[PDB]
Protein backbone atom coordinates (compact mmCIF):
# COMPACT_ATOMS: atom_id res chain seq x y z
CA UNK A 1 0.00 0.00 0.00
CA UNK A 2 2.70 2.54 0.93
CA UNK A 3 2.18 6.33 1.15
CA UNK A 4 2.61 9.54 -0.84
CA UNK A 5 6.34 10.14 -1.09
CA UNK A 6 7.54 6.54 -1.03
CA UNK A 7 10.31 6.16 -3.62
CA UNK A 8 8.87 4.84 -6.89
CA UNK A 9 10.59 1.43 -7.07
CA UNK A 10 9.99 0.86 -3.35
CA UNK A 11 6.29 1.66 -3.85
CA UNK A 12 6.08 -0.84 -6.73
CA UNK A 13 7.77 -3.41 -4.47
CA UNK A 14 5.26 -2.82 -1.68
CA UNK A 15 2.37 -3.18 -4.14
CA UNK A 16 3.78 -6.41 -5.57
CA UNK A 17 3.98 -7.84 -2.05
CA UNK A 18 0.38 -6.76 -1.36
CA UNK A 19 -0.86 -8.57 -4.47
CA UNK A 20 1.16 -11.66 -3.59
CA UNK A 21 -0.75 -12.01 -0.32
CA UNK A 22 0.48 -14.50 2.25
CA UNK A 23 0.23 -14.67 6.04
CA UNK A 24 1.51 -11.89 8.30
CA UNK A 25 5.10 -12.78 9.18
CA UNK A 26 4.34 -12.89 12.91
CA UNK A 27 1.78 -15.67 12.41
CA UNK A 28 4.52 -17.99 11.06
CA UNK A 29 6.78 -20.39 12.95
CA UNK A 30 10.32 -19.04 13.33
CA UNK A 31 11.42 -21.66 10.78
CA UNK A 32 8.85 -20.56 8.19
CA UNK A 33 9.51 -16.87 8.90
CA UNK A 34 13.23 -17.46 8.31
CA UNK A 35 12.40 -19.09 4.98
CA UNK A 36 10.51 -15.97 3.83
CA UNK A 37 13.67 -13.85 4.00
CA UNK A 38 15.88 -16.64 2.65
CA UNK A 39 13.63 -17.13 -0.37
CA UNK A 40 13.12 -13.45 -1.09
CA UNK A 41 16.85 -12.66 -0.90
CA UNK A 42 17.62 -15.56 -3.24
CA UNK A 43 15.09 -14.49 -5.87
CA UNK A 44 17.15 -11.55 -7.12
CA UNK A 45 20.34 -11.51 -9.17
CA UNK A 46 22.87 -9.42 -7.17
CA UNK A 47 26.54 -8.47 -7.48
CA UNK A 48 28.60 -10.26 -4.80
CA UNK A 49 32.01 -9.78 -6.47
CA UNK A 50 35.11 -8.20 -4.97
CA UNK A 51 35.12 -10.12 -1.69
CA UNK A 52 36.65 -13.27 -0.29
CA UNK A 53 34.66 -15.04 2.42
CA UNK A 54 36.09 -17.42 4.99
CA UNK A 55 34.51 -18.98 8.04
CA UNK A 56 36.27 -19.02 11.40
CA UNK A 57 35.13 -20.51 14.71
CA UNK A 58 36.48 -18.88 17.87
CA UNK A 59 36.47 -19.68 21.58
CA UNK A 60 35.23 -16.57 23.36
CA UNK A 61 33.60 -16.07 26.75
CA UNK A 62 32.94 -19.74 27.40
CA UNK A 63 31.46 -20.77 24.06
CA UNK A 64 32.22 -21.53 20.42
CA UNK A 65 31.19 -18.62 18.18
CA UNK A 66 31.07 -18.88 14.39
CA UNK A 67 32.34 -15.94 12.31
CA UNK A 68 32.29 -15.16 8.60
CA UNK A 69 35.28 -13.02 7.65
CA UNK A 70 34.61 -10.99 4.50
CA UNK A 71 37.73 -9.42 3.03
CA UNK A 72 38.19 -7.13 0.03
CA UNK A 73 39.53 -9.37 -2.74
CA UNK A 74 43.06 -9.10 -4.14
CA UNK A 75 44.39 -6.98 -1.28
CA UNK A 76 47.53 -7.84 0.68
CA UNK A 77 48.38 -7.02 4.27
CA UNK A 78 46.60 -6.12 7.48
CA UNK A 79 43.34 -4.26 6.95
CA UNK A 80 41.11 -2.40 9.38
CA UNK A 81 37.90 -4.17 10.36
CA UNK A 82 34.26 -3.73 11.33
CA UNK A 83 32.09 -6.20 13.20
CA UNK A 84 28.82 -6.86 11.40
CA UNK A 85 25.68 -7.71 13.35
CA UNK A 86 22.79 -8.84 11.14
CA UNK A 87 19.15 -7.80 11.37
CA UNK A 88 16.00 -9.85 11.00
CA UNK A 89 14.21 -8.99 14.24
CA UNK A 90 16.31 -11.48 16.26
CA UNK A 91 14.12 -14.29 14.92
CA UNK A 92 15.23 -14.09 11.29
CA UNK A 93 18.44 -13.42 9.43
CA UNK A 94 21.88 -14.97 9.07
CA UNK A 95 24.96 -14.55 6.89
CA UNK A 96 23.70 -15.49 3.42
CA UNK A 97 20.51 -13.38 3.70
CA UNK A 98 22.75 -10.45 4.58
CA UNK A 99 25.68 -11.21 2.29
CA UNK A 100 24.89 -8.59 -0.35
CA UNK A 101 24.61 -5.80 2.25
CA UNK A 102 27.84 -6.96 3.89
CA UNK A 103 29.56 -7.17 0.49
CA UNK A 104 28.51 -3.62 -0.35
CA UNK A 105 29.95 -2.35 2.94
CA UNK A 106 33.21 -4.25 2.44
CA UNK A 107 33.74 -3.26 -1.19
CA UNK A 108 32.77 0.34 -0.46
CA UNK A 109 35.02 0.69 2.59
CA UNK A 110 38.02 -1.46 1.75
CA UNK A 111 37.74 -2.81 5.29
CA UNK A 112 37.16 -6.38 6.45
CA UNK A 113 33.74 -7.35 7.85
CA UNK A 114 33.49 -9.87 10.67
CA UNK A 115 29.96 -11.30 10.65
CA UNK A 116 29.03 -12.85 14.01
CA UNK A 117 26.67 -15.83 13.98
CA UNK A 118 24.79 -14.97 17.16
CA UNK A 119 22.12 -17.33 18.50
CA UNK A 120 18.65 -16.44 17.13
CA UNK A 121 15.51 -16.00 19.20
CA UNK A 122 13.49 -17.65 20.59
CA UNK A 123 16.16 -20.39 20.72
CA UNK A 124 17.99 -17.91 22.94
CA UNK A 125 16.78 -14.75 24.68
CA UNK A 126 18.39 -11.48 25.77
CA UNK A 127 21.18 -11.07 26.65
CA UNK A 128 22.66 -14.14 24.95
CA UNK A 129 23.24 -12.65 21.50
CA UNK A 130 24.64 -9.32 22.72
CA UNK A 131 27.07 -11.18 25.00
CA UNK A 132 28.25 -13.25 22.01
CA UNK A 133 28.46 -10.09 19.93
CA UNK A 134 30.62 -8.32 22.50
CA UNK A 135 32.80 -11.40 23.10
CA UNK A 136 33.52 -11.64 19.37
CA UNK A 137 34.31 -7.93 19.19
CA UNK A 138 36.83 -8.22 22.03
CA UNK A 139 38.30 -11.33 20.36
CA UNK A 140 38.87 -9.53 17.07
CA UNK A 141 40.57 -6.65 18.91
CA UNK A 142 42.98 -9.08 20.59
CA UNK A 143 43.46 -11.69 17.86
CA UNK A 144 43.04 -9.70 14.64
CA UNK A 145 46.38 -10.83 13.21
CA UNK A 146 44.97 -14.38 13.00
CA UNK A 147 42.33 -13.26 10.50
CA UNK A 148 44.39 -10.69 8.62
CA UNK A 149 43.13 -7.54 10.31
CA UNK A 150 44.41 -4.74 12.50
CA UNK A 151 42.29 -5.17 15.62
CA UNK A 152 43.29 -1.71 16.86
CA UNK A 153 41.25 -0.17 14.04
CA UNK A 154 37.86 -1.63 14.84
CA UNK A 155 34.30 -0.46 14.17
CA UNK A 156 30.87 -1.97 14.84
CA UNK A 157 28.03 -2.01 12.30
CA UNK A 158 24.62 -3.53 11.80
CA UNK A 159 21.11 -3.11 10.37
CA UNK A 160 17.84 -3.06 12.30
CA UNK A 161 18.18 -5.20 15.44
CA UNK A 162 21.79 -5.51 14.29
CA UNK A 163 22.01 -1.75 14.67
CA UNK A 164 20.67 -2.22 18.19
CA UNK A 165 23.41 -4.81 18.66
CA UNK A 166 26.15 -2.52 17.36
CA UNK A 167 25.01 0.32 19.63
CA UNK A 168 24.84 -2.02 22.62
CA UNK A 169 28.26 -3.56 21.91
CA UNK A 170 29.65 -0.01 21.91
CA UNK A 171 28.05 0.55 25.34
CA UNK A 172 29.39 -2.79 26.60
CA UNK A 173 32.87 -1.89 25.37
CA UNK A 174 32.64 1.38 27.30
CA UNK A 175 31.46 -0.43 30.44
CA UNK A 176 34.25 -3.02 30.09
CA UNK A 177 36.89 -0.43 29.20
CA UNK A 178 37.79 -2.48 26.12
CA UNK A 179 38.15 -2.72 23.18
CA UNK A 180 38.71 0.72 21.69
CA UNK A 181 36.28 1.40 18.84
CA UNK A 182 36.75 3.84 15.96
CA UNK A 183 33.15 4.08 14.78
CA UNK A 184 29.61 2.77 15.11
CA UNK A 185 27.52 2.38 11.95
CA UNK A 186 23.85 2.18 12.94
CA UNK A 187 21.69 1.32 9.95
CA UNK A 188 18.00 1.96 10.75
CA UNK A 189 18.44 0.68 14.33
CA UNK A 190 15.97 -0.57 16.90
CA UNK A 191 16.67 1.48 20.04
CA UNK A 192 13.69 1.26 22.41
CA UNK A 193 11.22 -1.43 23.54
CA UNK A 194 8.29 0.95 23.29
CA UNK A 195 5.78 1.48 20.51
CA UNK A 196 4.33 4.98 20.91
CA UNK A 197 6.54 7.21 18.75
CA UNK A 198 4.90 9.25 15.99
CA UNK A 199 6.52 7.05 13.36
CA UNK A 200 5.22 3.86 15.02
CA UNK A 201 1.73 5.32 14.84
CA UNK A 202 2.02 6.58 11.27
CA UNK A 203 3.58 3.52 9.65
CA UNK A 204 1.96 0.72 11.68
CA UNK A 205 0.99 -1.15 8.50
CA UNK A 206 1.55 -1.03 4.74
CA UNK A 207 5.28 -0.27 4.81
CA UNK A 208 6.81 -3.78 4.99
CA UNK A 209 7.92 -3.70 8.64
CA UNK A 210 4.75 -3.54 10.72
CA UNK A 211 4.10 -2.76 14.36
CA UNK A 212 2.78 -6.32 14.68
CA UNK A 213 6.13 -7.65 13.49
CA UNK A 214 8.10 -5.45 15.90
CA UNK A 215 6.10 -6.59 18.90
CA UNK A 216 6.56 -10.21 17.88
CA UNK A 217 10.31 -9.65 17.38
CA UNK A 218 10.62 -8.09 20.84
CA UNK A 219 8.48 -10.84 22.40
CA UNK A 220 10.73 -13.55 20.94
CA UNK A 221 13.83 -11.68 22.14
CA UNK A 222 12.57 -11.28 25.72
CA UNK A 223 9.24 -10.87 27.52
CA UNK A 224 11.03 -9.79 30.73
CA UNK A 225 9.87 -6.18 31.20
CA UNK A 226 12.83 -5.44 33.47
CA UNK A 227 15.26 -6.67 30.83
CA UNK A 228 13.62 -4.40 28.25
CA UNK A 229 14.26 -1.39 30.47
CA UNK A 230 18.01 -2.06 30.59
CA UNK A 231 20.19 0.10 28.34
CA UNK A 232 21.60 -3.06 26.77
CA UNK A 233 18.13 -3.81 25.42
CA UNK A 234 16.82 -0.27 24.94
CA UNK A 235 19.84 2.03 24.54
CA UNK A 236 17.56 5.06 24.07
CA UNK A 237 16.98 4.81 27.83
CA UNK A 238 20.63 5.58 28.58
CA UNK A 239 21.45 8.88 30.31
CA UNK A 240 23.88 11.44 28.89
CA UNK A 241 26.45 10.24 31.40
CA UNK A 242 26.01 6.64 30.24
CA UNK A 243 26.48 7.67 26.59
CA UNK A 244 29.48 9.93 27.20
CA UNK A 245 32.65 8.85 25.38
CA UNK A 246 31.05 6.48 22.87
CA UNK A 247 32.67 6.27 19.41
CA UNK A 248 31.58 8.53 16.51
CA UNK A 249 28.38 7.35 14.86
CA UNK A 250 26.63 7.40 11.52
CA UNK A 251 22.93 6.72 11.96
CA UNK A 252 20.86 6.26 8.81
CA UNK A 253 17.10 6.17 9.25
CA UNK A 254 14.32 5.43 6.76
CA UNK A 255 11.53 7.99 6.30
CA UNK A 256 8.76 5.39 6.09
CA UNK A 257 9.69 3.20 9.04
CA UNK A 258 8.08 2.68 12.45
CA UNK A 259 11.60 2.71 13.89
CA UNK A 260 12.53 6.05 12.32
CA UNK A 261 11.82 8.24 15.34
CA UNK A 262 13.62 6.12 17.93
CA UNK A 263 16.69 5.91 15.68
CA UNK A 264 16.76 9.68 15.26
CA UNK A 265 16.08 10.13 18.98
CA UNK A 266 19.09 7.95 19.80
CA UNK A 267 21.26 10.09 17.53
CA UNK A 268 20.03 13.14 19.43
CA UNK A 269 20.89 11.55 22.77
CA UNK A 270 24.41 10.75 21.56
CA UNK A 271 24.82 14.35 20.38
CA UNK A 272 23.52 15.74 23.69
CA UNK A 273 26.12 13.56 25.42
CA UNK A 274 28.96 15.03 23.36
CA UNK A 275 29.39 12.05 21.04
CA UNK A 276 30.13 12.90 17.40
CA UNK A 277 27.09 11.91 15.32
CA UNK A 278 26.00 12.18 11.72
CA UNK A 279 22.29 11.41 11.53
CA UNK A 280 20.77 11.12 8.08
CA UNK A 281 17.19 10.35 7.13
CA UNK A 282 16.84 8.65 3.75
CA UNK A 283 13.54 9.93 2.43
CA UNK A 284 11.31 7.65 0.38
CA UNK A 285 12.77 4.53 2.02
CA UNK A 286 11.26 1.69 4.06
CA UNK A 287 12.93 -0.28 6.86
CA UNK A 288 15.83 -2.50 5.72
CA UNK A 289 16.13 -0.63 2.40
CA UNK A 290 19.82 -1.62 2.38
CA UNK A 291 19.12 -5.28 3.19
CA UNK A 292 16.31 -6.27 0.84
CA UNK A 293 17.76 -7.55 -2.43
CA UNK A 294 14.75 -6.46 -4.52
CA UNK A 295 15.65 -2.87 -3.53
CA UNK A 296 19.43 -3.18 -3.95
CA UNK A 297 19.56 -1.28 -7.27
CA UNK A 298 17.25 1.56 -6.20
CA UNK A 299 19.39 4.67 -6.72
CA UNK A 300 18.78 6.09 -3.22
CA UNK A 301 19.78 2.71 -1.77
CA UNK A 302 23.00 2.68 -3.76
CA UNK A 303 23.74 6.20 -2.55
CA UNK A 304 23.06 5.18 1.06
CA UNK A 305 25.37 2.18 0.70
CA UNK A 306 28.12 4.30 -0.88
CA UNK A 307 27.86 6.62 2.14
CA UNK A 308 27.93 3.78 4.67
CA UNK A 309 31.07 2.31 3.10
CA UNK A 310 32.79 5.68 2.77
CA UNK A 311 32.13 6.60 6.39
CA UNK A 312 33.54 3.27 7.57
CA UNK A 313 36.63 3.97 5.45
CA UNK A 314 37.06 7.52 6.79
CA UNK A 315 37.01 6.33 10.41
CA UNK A 316 39.25 3.29 9.94
CA UNK A 317 42.36 5.00 8.52
CA UNK A 318 45.84 4.86 10.00
CA UNK A 319 46.07 7.63 12.66
CA UNK B 1 48.74 -17.44 -26.60
CA UNK B 2 46.07 -20.05 -27.43
CA UNK B 3 45.61 -21.72 -30.84
CA UNK B 4 43.58 -21.48 -34.05
CA UNK B 5 40.05 -22.52 -33.14
CA UNK B 6 39.98 -21.35 -29.53
CA UNK B 7 36.61 -19.69 -28.87
CA UNK B 8 36.92 -15.91 -29.30
CA UNK B 9 36.24 -14.76 -25.72
CA UNK B 10 38.41 -17.57 -24.34
CA UNK B 11 41.24 -16.49 -26.67
CA UNK B 12 40.94 -12.88 -25.47
CA UNK B 13 41.04 -14.19 -21.88
CA UNK B 14 44.21 -16.18 -22.56
CA UNK B 15 45.85 -13.13 -24.16
CA UNK B 16 44.90 -10.89 -21.23
CA UNK B 17 46.52 -13.37 -18.85
CA UNK B 18 49.66 -13.48 -21.02
CA UNK B 19 49.98 -9.69 -20.89
CA UNK B 20 49.39 -9.67 -17.14
CA UNK B 21 52.47 -11.83 -16.62
CA UNK B 22 53.09 -13.32 -13.19
CA UNK B 23 54.88 -16.45 -12.00
CA UNK B 24 53.93 -19.93 -13.20
CA UNK B 25 51.37 -21.27 -10.73
CA UNK B 26 53.57 -24.24 -9.80
CA UNK B 27 56.35 -21.94 -8.58
CA UNK B 28 54.02 -20.52 -5.89
CA UNK B 29 53.44 -21.73 -2.33
CA UNK B 30 50.13 -23.57 -1.96
CA UNK B 31 48.84 -20.54 -0.02
CA UNK B 32 49.76 -18.09 -2.79
CA UNK B 33 48.48 -20.45 -5.50
CA UNK B 34 45.15 -20.69 -3.68
CA UNK B 35 44.97 -16.89 -3.61
CA UNK B 36 45.33 -16.73 -7.41
CA UNK B 37 42.07 -18.63 -7.92
CA UNK B 38 40.34 -16.85 -5.04
CA UNK B 39 41.22 -13.43 -6.43
CA UNK B 40 40.39 -14.25 -10.03
CA UNK B 41 37.00 -15.74 -9.16
CA UNK B 42 36.15 -12.69 -7.05
CA UNK B 43 37.03 -10.20 -9.80
CA UNK B 44 33.94 -10.93 -11.88
CA UNK B 45 30.30 -10.02 -11.25
CA UNK B 46 28.33 -13.31 -11.44
CA UNK B 47 24.74 -14.44 -10.88
CA UNK B 48 24.49 -16.53 -7.69
CA UNK B 49 20.71 -16.20 -7.24
CA UNK B 50 18.18 -19.00 -6.90
CA UNK B 51 19.99 -21.02 -4.25
CA UNK B 52 20.06 -21.29 -0.49
CA UNK B 53 23.36 -22.34 1.07
CA UNK B 54 23.78 -23.93 4.47
CA UNK B 55 26.80 -25.48 6.12
CA UNK B 56 26.62 -28.83 7.87
CA UNK B 57 29.35 -30.75 9.70
CA UNK B 58 29.00 -34.54 9.80
CA UNK B 59 30.71 -37.40 11.60
CA UNK B 60 31.69 -39.93 8.96
CA UNK B 61 34.34 -42.64 8.90
CA UNK B 62 36.17 -41.46 12.00
CA UNK B 63 36.39 -37.74 11.29
CA UNK B 64 34.46 -34.47 11.14
CA UNK B 65 33.69 -33.50 7.54
CA UNK B 66 32.34 -30.09 6.57
CA UNK B 67 29.61 -29.89 3.90
CA UNK B 68 27.96 -27.00 2.09
CA UNK B 69 24.39 -27.89 1.15
CA UNK B 70 23.17 -25.86 -1.83
CA UNK B 71 19.42 -26.09 -2.37
CA UNK B 72 17.20 -24.60 -5.08
CA UNK B 73 15.51 -21.60 -3.45
CA UNK B 74 11.78 -21.45 -2.68
CA UNK B 75 11.20 -25.19 -3.11
CA UNK B 76 9.47 -27.34 -0.52
CA UNK B 77 9.95 -31.03 0.21
CA UNK B 78 12.56 -33.71 -0.30
CA UNK B 79 14.71 -33.17 -3.39
CA UNK B 80 17.14 -35.47 -5.15
CA UNK B 81 20.82 -34.71 -4.62
CA UNK B 82 24.28 -34.76 -6.18
CA UNK B 83 27.59 -34.75 -4.34
CA UNK B 84 29.91 -32.04 -5.63
CA UNK B 85 33.67 -32.52 -5.57
CA UNK B 86 35.61 -29.36 -6.42
CA UNK B 87 38.61 -29.03 -8.72
CA UNK B 88 41.78 -27.00 -8.32
CA UNK B 89 44.41 -29.69 -8.80
CA UNK B 90 44.05 -30.93 -5.19
CA UNK B 91 46.18 -27.99 -4.05
CA UNK B 92 43.70 -25.23 -4.88
CA UNK B 93 39.95 -24.77 -4.74
CA UNK B 94 37.21 -24.71 -2.12
CA UNK B 95 33.52 -23.83 -1.90
CA UNK B 96 33.49 -20.10 -2.65
CA UNK B 97 35.83 -20.38 -5.67
CA UNK B 98 33.44 -22.99 -7.04
CA UNK B 99 30.15 -21.47 -5.90
CA UNK B 100 29.09 -20.10 -9.28
CA UNK B 101 29.64 -23.46 -11.01
CA UNK B 102 27.77 -25.24 -8.22
CA UNK B 103 24.95 -22.68 -8.37
CA UNK B 104 24.59 -23.18 -12.12
CA UNK B 105 24.31 -26.95 -11.64
CA UNK B 106 21.76 -26.58 -8.84
CA UNK B 107 19.57 -24.01 -10.58
CA UNK B 108 19.76 -25.92 -13.86
CA UNK B 109 18.92 -29.30 -12.34
CA UNK B 110 16.53 -28.46 -9.52
CA UNK B 111 18.56 -30.86 -7.39
CA UNK B 112 20.48 -30.19 -4.19
CA UNK B 113 24.30 -30.07 -4.31
CA UNK B 114 26.33 -31.36 -1.37
CA UNK B 115 29.79 -29.80 -1.56
CA UNK B 116 32.37 -31.79 0.42
CA UNK B 117 35.22 -29.86 2.03
CA UNK B 118 37.92 -32.48 1.50
CA UNK B 119 41.42 -31.91 2.88
CA UNK B 120 43.67 -30.19 0.29
CA UNK B 121 47.14 -31.33 -0.72
CA UNK B 122 49.91 -31.28 0.31
CA UNK B 123 48.35 -30.94 3.80
CA UNK B 124 46.98 -34.41 3.06
CA UNK B 125 47.89 -36.93 0.37
CA UNK B 126 46.05 -39.70 -1.48
CA UNK B 127 43.86 -41.38 -0.44
CA UNK B 128 42.69 -38.99 2.29
CA UNK B 129 40.40 -36.81 0.19
CA UNK B 130 38.77 -39.65 -1.75
CA UNK B 131 38.06 -41.47 1.52
CA UNK B 132 36.38 -38.33 2.88
CA UNK B 133 34.51 -37.93 -0.40
CA UNK B 134 33.18 -41.49 -0.28
CA UNK B 135 32.33 -41.27 3.44
CA UNK B 136 30.26 -38.14 2.81
CA UNK B 137 28.52 -39.78 -0.14
CA UNK B 138 27.52 -42.78 1.98
CA UNK B 139 26.39 -40.40 4.76
CA UNK B 140 24.09 -38.48 2.43
CA UNK B 141 22.58 -41.75 1.19
CA UNK B 142 21.78 -42.81 4.76
CA UNK B 143 20.97 -39.46 6.38
CA UNK B 144 19.51 -37.42 3.52
CA UNK B 145 16.31 -36.59 5.40
CA UNK B 146 18.40 -34.51 7.84
CA UNK B 147 19.42 -32.13 5.06
CA UNK B 148 16.17 -32.15 3.10
CA UNK B 149 17.12 -34.62 0.38
CA UNK B 150 16.13 -38.05 -0.86
CA UNK B 151 19.36 -40.00 -0.40
CA UNK B 152 18.06 -42.81 -2.61
CA UNK B 153 18.30 -40.49 -5.61
CA UNK B 154 21.97 -39.66 -5.47
CA UNK B 155 24.52 -38.63 -8.12
CA UNK B 156 28.19 -37.64 -7.99
CA UNK B 157 29.66 -34.68 -9.87
CA UNK B 158 32.86 -32.68 -10.08
CA UNK B 159 35.25 -30.70 -12.28
CA UNK B 160 38.88 -31.51 -13.06
CA UNK B 161 40.41 -33.41 -10.12
CA UNK B 162 36.87 -33.24 -8.74
CA UNK B 163 35.82 -35.23 -11.80
CA UNK B 164 38.54 -37.72 -10.86
CA UNK B 165 37.02 -37.74 -7.38
CA UNK B 166 33.49 -38.33 -8.65
CA UNK B 167 34.64 -41.20 -10.87
CA UNK B 168 36.61 -42.74 -8.01
CA UNK B 169 33.74 -42.37 -5.52
CA UNK B 170 31.58 -44.27 -8.03
CA UNK B 171 34.21 -47.04 -8.12
CA UNK B 172 34.43 -47.06 -4.31
CA UNK B 173 30.65 -47.31 -4.07
CA UNK B 174 30.76 -50.32 -6.40
CA UNK B 175 33.53 -51.94 -4.35
CA UNK B 176 31.64 -51.28 -1.10
CA UNK B 177 28.28 -52.32 -2.55
CA UNK B 178 26.80 -49.02 -1.35
CA UNK B 179 25.37 -46.47 -1.88
CA UNK B 180 23.36 -46.81 -5.08
CA UNK B 181 24.16 -43.99 -7.51
CA UNK B 182 21.94 -42.67 -10.31
CA UNK B 183 24.56 -40.79 -12.32
CA UNK B 184 28.14 -39.56 -12.51
CA UNK B 185 28.80 -36.12 -13.97
CA UNK B 186 32.47 -35.90 -14.97
CA UNK B 187 33.39 -32.37 -16.01
CA UNK B 188 36.77 -32.36 -17.80
CA UNK B 189 38.17 -35.02 -15.43
CA UNK B 190 41.70 -36.05 -14.57
CA UNK B 191 41.80 -39.83 -15.10
CA UNK B 192 45.42 -40.98 -15.39
CA UNK B 193 48.75 -40.16 -13.72
CA UNK B 194 50.59 -40.17 -17.03
CA UNK B 195 51.53 -37.34 -19.34
CA UNK B 196 52.03 -38.78 -22.82
CA UNK B 197 48.63 -38.46 -24.52
CA UNK B 198 48.41 -36.51 -27.78
CA UNK B 199 46.52 -33.73 -26.02
CA UNK B 200 49.18 -33.46 -23.29
CA UNK B 201 51.78 -32.99 -26.01
CA UNK B 202 49.75 -30.53 -28.06
CA UNK B 203 48.54 -28.24 -25.27
CA UNK B 204 51.53 -28.36 -22.89
CA UNK B 205 51.60 -24.55 -22.63
CA UNK B 206 49.57 -21.51 -23.65
CA UNK B 207 46.13 -22.88 -22.78
CA UNK B 208 45.79 -21.94 -19.08
CA UNK B 209 46.27 -25.43 -17.60
CA UNK B 210 49.84 -26.45 -18.38
CA UNK B 211 51.66 -29.76 -18.22
CA UNK B 212 53.89 -28.16 -15.57
CA UNK B 213 50.84 -27.46 -13.43
CA UNK B 214 49.49 -31.00 -13.82
CA UNK B 215 52.75 -32.58 -12.73
CA UNK B 216 52.90 -30.27 -9.72
CA UNK B 217 49.27 -31.08 -8.86
CA UNK B 218 49.97 -34.82 -9.02
CA UNK B 219 53.21 -34.42 -7.03
CA UNK B 220 51.37 -32.60 -4.23
CA UNK B 221 48.64 -35.26 -4.24
CA UNK B 222 51.08 -38.19 -4.00
CA UNK B 223 54.61 -39.04 -5.15
CA UNK B 224 54.05 -42.75 -4.39
CA UNK B 225 54.29 -44.39 -7.84
CA UNK B 226 52.41 -47.45 -6.60
CA UNK B 227 49.54 -45.29 -5.36
CA UNK B 228 49.34 -43.59 -8.76
CA UNK B 229 48.87 -46.97 -10.43
CA UNK B 230 45.81 -47.79 -8.30
CA UNK B 231 42.42 -47.35 -9.98
CA UNK B 232 41.39 -45.02 -7.16
CA UNK B 233 44.09 -42.60 -8.31
CA UNK B 234 44.11 -43.36 -12.04
CA UNK B 235 40.69 -44.79 -12.94
CA UNK B 236 41.68 -45.07 -16.61
CA UNK B 237 43.77 -48.06 -15.49
CA UNK B 238 40.67 -50.01 -14.47
CA UNK B 239 39.77 -53.14 -16.46
CA UNK B 240 36.39 -53.65 -18.13
CA UNK B 241 35.47 -55.99 -15.29
CA UNK B 242 36.34 -53.33 -12.72
CA UNK B 243 34.20 -50.75 -14.52
CA UNK B 244 31.21 -53.04 -15.09
CA UNK B 245 27.98 -51.85 -13.43
CA UNK B 246 29.01 -48.24 -12.79
CA UNK B 247 26.25 -45.59 -13.01
CA UNK B 248 25.44 -43.76 -16.27
CA UNK B 249 27.90 -40.98 -17.04
CA UNK B 250 28.07 -37.65 -18.80
CA UNK B 251 31.67 -36.75 -19.56
CA UNK B 252 32.34 -33.28 -20.95
CA UNK B 253 35.84 -32.62 -22.25
CA UNK B 254 37.47 -29.41 -23.49
CA UNK B 255 39.04 -29.37 -26.96
CA UNK B 256 42.08 -27.34 -25.89
CA UNK B 257 43.03 -29.20 -22.72
CA UNK B 258 45.96 -31.49 -21.90
CA UNK B 259 43.44 -33.69 -20.07
CA UNK B 260 41.11 -34.01 -23.05
CA UNK B 261 42.36 -37.36 -24.32
CA UNK B 262 42.39 -39.17 -20.98
CA UNK B 263 38.85 -37.96 -20.24
CA UNK B 264 37.62 -39.22 -23.60
CA UNK B 265 39.59 -42.44 -23.13
CA UNK B 266 37.86 -43.03 -19.79
CA UNK B 267 34.47 -42.56 -21.45
CA UNK B 268 35.50 -45.17 -24.01
CA UNK B 269 36.52 -47.61 -21.27
CA UNK B 270 33.16 -47.17 -19.54
CA UNK B 271 31.37 -47.79 -22.84
CA UNK B 272 33.47 -50.90 -23.56
CA UNK B 273 32.47 -52.16 -20.11
CA UNK B 274 28.75 -51.76 -20.86
CA UNK B 275 28.24 -48.60 -18.82
CA UNK B 276 25.90 -46.01 -20.36
CA UNK B 277 28.00 -42.98 -21.35
CA UNK B 278 27.43 -39.70 -23.12
CA UNK B 279 30.81 -38.21 -24.00
CA UNK B 280 30.83 -34.70 -25.41
CA UNK B 281 33.79 -32.60 -26.47
CA UNK B 282 33.20 -28.86 -26.17
CA UNK B 283 35.21 -27.39 -29.00
CA UNK B 284 36.95 -24.04 -28.55
CA UNK B 285 37.16 -24.52 -24.76
CA UNK B 286 40.06 -24.67 -22.30
CA UNK B 287 40.24 -26.69 -19.08
CA UNK B 288 37.84 -25.53 -16.34
CA UNK B 289 35.74 -23.55 -18.84
CA UNK B 290 32.77 -24.09 -16.51
CA UNK B 291 34.68 -23.03 -13.39
CA UNK B 292 36.46 -19.83 -14.37
CA UNK B 293 34.22 -16.85 -13.68
CA UNK B 294 35.72 -14.70 -16.45
CA UNK B 295 34.38 -17.33 -18.89
CA UNK B 296 30.99 -17.84 -17.23
CA UNK B 297 29.03 -15.82 -19.83
CA UNK B 298 30.73 -17.34 -22.89
CA UNK B 299 27.81 -18.79 -24.87
CA UNK B 300 29.37 -22.26 -25.28
CA UNK B 301 29.98 -22.33 -21.53
CA UNK B 302 26.37 -21.46 -20.81
CA UNK B 303 25.27 -24.21 -23.19
CA UNK B 304 27.58 -26.71 -21.49
CA UNK B 305 26.22 -25.74 -18.07
CA UNK B 306 22.62 -26.01 -19.28
CA UNK B 307 23.43 -29.54 -20.47
CA UNK B 308 25.14 -30.53 -17.23
CA UNK B 309 22.15 -29.38 -15.17
CA UNK B 310 19.62 -31.00 -17.49
CA UNK B 311 21.41 -34.34 -17.45
CA UNK B 312 21.53 -34.31 -13.65
CA UNK B 313 17.79 -33.60 -13.65
CA UNK B 314 17.00 -36.39 -16.14
CA UNK B 315 18.82 -39.00 -14.04
CA UNK B 316 17.48 -37.89 -10.65
CA UNK B 317 13.73 -38.22 -11.32
CA UNK B 318 11.31 -40.37 -9.34
CA UNK B 319 11.44 -43.92 -10.83
TrEMBL record, chains A, B:
<feature type="domain" description="Alpha/beta hydrolase fold-3">
    <location>
        <begin position="83"/>
        <end position="289"/>
    </location>
</feature>
<dbReference type="GO" id="GO:0016787">
    <property type="term" value="F:hydrolase activity"/>
</dbReference>
<dbReference type="Pfam" id="PF07859">
    <property type="entry name" value="Abhydrolase_3"/>
</dbReference>
<keyword id="KW-0378">Hydrolase</keyword>
<dbReference type="InterPro" id="IPR050300">
    <property type="entry name" value="GDXG_lipolytic_enzyme"/>
</dbReference>
<comment type="similarity">
    <text>Belongs to the 'GDXG' lipolytic enzyme family.</text>
</comment>
<dbReference type="InterPro" id="IPR013094">
    <property type="entry name" value="AB_hydrolase_3"/>
</dbReference>
<dbReference type="InterPro" id="IPR002168">
    <property type="entry name" value="Lipase_GDXG_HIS_AS"/>
</dbReference>
<protein>
    <submittedName>
        <fullName>Alpha/beta hydrolase fold-3 domain protein</fullName>
    </submittedName>
</protein>
<dbReference type="InterPro" id="IPR029058">
    <property type="entry name" value="AB_hydrolase_fold"/>
</dbReference>
